Amino acid sequence: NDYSVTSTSAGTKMQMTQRDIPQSVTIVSQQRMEDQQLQTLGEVMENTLGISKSQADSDRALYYSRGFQIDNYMVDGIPTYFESRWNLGDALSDMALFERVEVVRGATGLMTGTGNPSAAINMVRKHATSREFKGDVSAEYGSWNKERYVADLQSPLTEDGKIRARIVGGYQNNDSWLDRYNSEKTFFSGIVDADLGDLTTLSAGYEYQRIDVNSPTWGGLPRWNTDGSSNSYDRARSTAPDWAYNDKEINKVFMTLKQQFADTWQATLNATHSEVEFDSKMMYVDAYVNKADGMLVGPYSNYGPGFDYVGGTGWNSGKRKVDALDLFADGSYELFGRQHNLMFGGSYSKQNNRYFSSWANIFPDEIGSFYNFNGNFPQTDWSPQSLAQDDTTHMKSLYAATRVTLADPLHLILGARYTNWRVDTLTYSMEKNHTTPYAGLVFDINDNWSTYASYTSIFQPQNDRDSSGKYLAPITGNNYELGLKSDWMNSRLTTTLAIFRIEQDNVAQSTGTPIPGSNGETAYKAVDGTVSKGVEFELNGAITDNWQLTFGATRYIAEDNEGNAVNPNLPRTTVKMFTSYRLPVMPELTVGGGVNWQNRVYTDTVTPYGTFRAEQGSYALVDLFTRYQVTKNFSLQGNVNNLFDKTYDTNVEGSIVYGTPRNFSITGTYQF
Ligand SMILES: CCCCCCCCO[C@@H]1O[C@H](CO)[C@@H](O)[C@H](O)[C@H]1O
Ligand SMILES: CCCCCCCCO[C@@H]1O[C@H](CO)[C@@H](O)[C@H](O)[C@H]1O
Ligand SMILES: CCCCCCCCO[C@@H]1O[C@H](CO)[C@@H](O)[C@H](O)[C@H]1O
Ligand SMILES: CCCCCCCCO[C@@H]1O[C@H](CO)[C@@H](O)[C@H](O)[C@H]1O
Ligand SMILES: CCCCCCCCO[C@@H]1O[C@H](CO)[C@@H](O)[C@H](O)[C@H]1O
């Protein structure tokens, strides 16, 4: 029921309160997710301070933090990596399966081997913890024929309550503001928690998710006319044909073993085998519009006659396999007459991604005037799919970190992760070894206020070679941070103020000279990359016993080596707040809502006719909720999203993608 979650293992791999973490940490609680109906990982991230989204199409969105892209999401500290163009729906993961989401902003190289200096996102699974049959079931009806049904049930399976089990299952069907769009999803997670004898705990489970989308969009609506004037469409407008579909199926097995070897020492072994399979047939439009006739003009027609295509069709299928295990120990040691905490462990991960494609380009004659276009396009007589990609990544790490007690109110965190990383591709192989250091310092001024200072890093390997022919050294994302954290009411209310600087280094830059003794391979030089700098402030917790409020604000600057704004489509200033208020005179009633505000964003498009700049001015989005506790078991929740019905663009960096219009939702819940 509390917005503030007391402790976390996030950032350092050591169990502590947020105050003791010398990094910017945000934790999204179960209650916040229930109040605002954050049902997907994507919805959690877009309502999280310092995280922004870019929606390429109806089901594909990418998430950014501090000017950089998040390239992996994790489940119980196990990460799964992805490429921008191969979106396996990881942000569509159903939240009903997870207790909470831990967000760490900056360089998270101690938690994971590779990545960008953006953010680590960790989804924590629901566990069977009650010693009594407990659960809840719910039915939700909303706008665009949405129906959502969820059951969460748990119980011990033995008289002593040593063996316990929890099952979460659900189904959702809905349409959209988009013409012909339909999504159907099934989700299910099962877990068995058994306390083996004394000092041993074992967890084992299975996760299944399936999302089938009909008429999903690919790309956006033509933003530009040949004369430079911009275009506007009804938010219901879709380029998705009736034969278009995207279907994905997720199957995972996972086990966690915890052993208490001695007083103050515990060993943990987390393992997972994950698989996702997808099949899709879709069509996209990517062109300018000739205002007089409505005819489309290709953005690459300058290259010649075979390059004037205005869209495409594609039949894409594939499979991702993840076999990963994390083994670590945490305990105490005494040096210089004082107790200090020590964490050490290892990681192994094997990730394979195999894709099949069949595709064709679309020319202006094939589609006709865009003014009469509504997905009414003939399906391609698909040729046989061919192996488009087959990649295997082996990531192996050894990591150690100690929290040193310099004095009672002063702690120094010193860590390092060494990583052996390898990729095997159809065209090449690359192996890289890197040591990522962690240095932090936390000073407790008094019982409620603390200051911190930290140096954190992460590395990103790159498929670029120098004049010698050797692969270029990986990109390092270095985060320098100073801040102030407060804790009140035994961590029930917390505040954080962070000032950061990110230096992305060893970024490949073309020399404009080919590699001697190669077939035109371009030679690259390692140079300083993106520099990002900003401030974050968040207040999270209970103001009073019946008033829970989360309030955040950020402002940052991100620029490349040249000095140009990196991703100008993402807001530099944002304010995200959400609140819950239970009436002291009527405690059966809880009211609330929230406001997400962002400043102006833009994107320049260099075309043949000149430079066209996309604009999206300042806007807020308002959500409201109310919950009435009818009986000790039954409650009714009503939610309104985008109350002022703001028309806004979620894809300023490309073709027009509209954001969610005003939507309503009624939910009945039976708890016990
Ligand atoms: C959609 C789910 C509706 C659940 C309605 C549950 C009604 C519970 O009903 C109770 O169940 C108990 C045993 O479980 C019995 O011991 C009680 O006598 C009975 O009143
Ligand atoms: C052992 C602990 C060492 C921690 C080193 C952290 C140094 C902080 O680094 C500083 O952070 C500022 C951002 O607030 C930047 O403006 C400064 O340029 C940067 O030097
Ligand atoms: C007590 C203050 C300690 C450092 C926190 C303030 C850091 C704010 O950031 C500062 O912004 C300035 C320009 O606005 C730059 O000149 C500084 O390099 C940069 O550190
Ligand atoms: C001392 C505690 C912080 C004081 C309030 C925050 C003011 C931070 O100052 C801001 O920091 C940014 C990041 O370095 C700079 O880019 C901005 O120019 C500067 O205004
Ligand atoms: C798939 C739908 C599952 C419905 C499960 C209903 C479980 C009811 O469970 C019962 O609920 C009663 C209160 O309603 C309590 O008296 C009992 O503790 C509990 O056993």
Numbering used by the authors: 58 to 729
From the paper:
The TonB-dependent transporter FhuE is integrated in the outer membrane of Gram-negative bacteria and has been reported to scavenge these fungally produced coprogens. FhuE belongs to the TonB-dependent transporter (TBDT) family and has been shown to be both necessary and sufficient for the utilization of fungally produced coprogens by Escherichia coli and other Gram-negative bacteria. Using this tool, it is shown that while FhuE is highly active in the import of coprogens, it has some level of promiscuity, acting as a low-affinity transporter for related siderophores. To determine the molecular basis for the transport of both high-affinity and low-affinity substrates by FhuE, we solved the crystal structure of FhuE in complex with Fe-coprogen. The structure of FhuE consists of a canonical TBDT fold consisting of a 22-stranded transmembrane β-barrel, the lumen of which is occluded by a globular plug domain [Fig. 3(a)].
Notably, all three hydroxamate groups of coprogen are coordinated by FhuE through two arginine residues (Arg117 and Arg142) and a tryptophan residue (Trp275). An additional hydrogen bond is observed between one of the keto O atoms of the coprogen diketopiperazine ring and an asparagine residue (Asn373), with the remainder of the binding pocket being composed of hydrophobic interactions [Fig. 3(b), Supplementary Fig. S5(b) and Supplementary Movie S1]. The planar nature of the FhuE binding pocket does not allow the coordination of the Fe-ferrichrome complex without significant clashes. The direct coordination via Arg142 of the hydroxamate groups appears to act as a selectivity filter, only allowing Fe-hydroxamate complexes in a planar configuration to be accommodated in the substrate-binding pocket [Figs. 3(b), 3(c) and 3(d)]. To determine the structural and biochemical basis for its selectivity and transport activity, we solved the crystal structure of FhuE in complex with coprogen. These data show that FhuE employs a selectivity filter in its substrate-binding site, making it specific for planar hydroxamate siderophores.
